[PDB]
């Protein structure tokens, strides 16, 4: 249960495509979130009585850049939080949130970057998914491209989303080819490639760092959705994914009894465990989020209504839905984010507005 305590709008009037709370903020520090839209990323700090305090932006030198996505991590040596941002230029920027300086940047993808995710156990491993049909895993400690996930048996159109499982042993990706694909990263090959990426220092050797070209997923399906698949998340060994068909589907590879780690590349079946329907979300690039504990899931629709499902129930199809509406919130909500303590939910919109809901 939540109530709307404040809203604001950013001056550019372009869509805000992304929002993320920093879940690596120190004890006793105020809750901070980043928004991305137009050619900028902006940080805000949440205070009492609904106050949303504007801090500082990073604004790209290219007026034609459009940032789509951001993801928090921290510097593994200093603990200081870092923020990665990317979008239409296909350039990943690593931003120091304190000063909003761009510390370094990576380029590879043949196009726009649609999503960034950090590995759940290793703050240096950054996944990017691209309009060029590939995913890339980067090590931002050694500045190395560890692997490219692609090929003719990889995605055949834009990759729109991906997610690591809890342990960071595998990734599920999804995109415009209507497919969801599993890529295991705990193979001997991949764990070795990771270990070598940490051993690489271009000042101490002559070799370039060789990336893995991974051209075959460990599972693939087009049997969940019938249109572009634009958001995916692991829930334990199950998958939650959505398309633009007004449903989030909960499913797993194989038959009901099949262990995720026994699934082979040729597996032809999937099992649907449930489906959460909602209304008026027919456009693509509309992302749901979960709280830190994965007890809840929030999604906005294309007319400014928020749906929140309580997943603290015995089976996925028993999820309990709550809806959150405000008479002044009428634009498409692109993404939501919960604070780490679950006390605040933020929604951002196509009209550049930001909406704060307090628990």
């Amino acid at each position: 249960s939540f109530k709307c305590v404040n809203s604001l709008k950013e001056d550019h009037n372009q869509p805000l495509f992304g929002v993320q709370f920093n879940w690596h903020s120190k004890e006793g520090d105020p809750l901070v979130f980043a928004t991305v839209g137009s050619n900028r990323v902006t940080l805000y700090e949440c205070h009492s009585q609904g106050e949303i305090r504007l801090l500082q932006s990073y604004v790209d030198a290219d007026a034609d850049e459009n940032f789509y996505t951001c993801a928090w991590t921290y510097d593994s040596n200093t603990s200081h939080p870092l923020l990665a941002v990317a979008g239409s230029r296909g350039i990943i920027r690593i931003i120091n949130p304190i000063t909003m300086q761009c510390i370094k940047h990576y380029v590879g993808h043949g196009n726009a970057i649609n999503e960034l995710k950090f590995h759940p156990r290793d703050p240096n491993l950054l996944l990017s998914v691209s309009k060029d049909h590939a995913l890339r895993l980067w090590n931002i400690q050694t500045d190395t491209l560890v692997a490219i996930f692609g090929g003719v048996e990889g995605h055949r159109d834009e990759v729109l989303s991906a997610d690591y499982d809890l342990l960071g042993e595998k990734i599920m990706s999804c995109g415009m080819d209507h497919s969801l694909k599993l890529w295991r990263i705990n193979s001997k090959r991949m764990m070795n490639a990771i270990k070598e990426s940490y051993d690489y220092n271009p000042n101490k050797t002559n070799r370039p760092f060789i990336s893995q070209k991974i051209h075959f997923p460990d599972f693939s399906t087009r049997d969940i959705h019938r249109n572009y698949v634009d958001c995916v998340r692991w829930l334990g060994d199950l998958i939650l994914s959505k398309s633009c068909e007004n449903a989030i589907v909960c499913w797993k590879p194989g038959k009901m009894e099949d262990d995720i780690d026994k699934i082979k590349p040729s597996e032809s079946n999937v099992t649907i465990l449930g489906r959460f329907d909602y209304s008026q979300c027919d456009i693509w690039y509309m992302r749901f989020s979960m709280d830190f504990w994965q007890k809840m899931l929030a999604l906005g629709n294309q007319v400014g209504k928020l749906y929140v499902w309580d997943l603290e129930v015995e089976d996925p199809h028993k999820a309990k839905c709550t809806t959150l509406t405000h008479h002044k919130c009428g634009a498409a909500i692109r993404q939501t984010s919960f604070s780490r303590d679950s006390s605040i939910l933020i929604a951002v919109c196509d009209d550049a507005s930001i909406w704060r809901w307090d628990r």
Binding site: P15, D282, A332, D350
Partner: peptide, 5 residues
């Protein structure tokens, strides 16, 4: 499928 309404 359209990206915006």
């Amino acid at each position: 499928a359209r990206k915006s309404a």
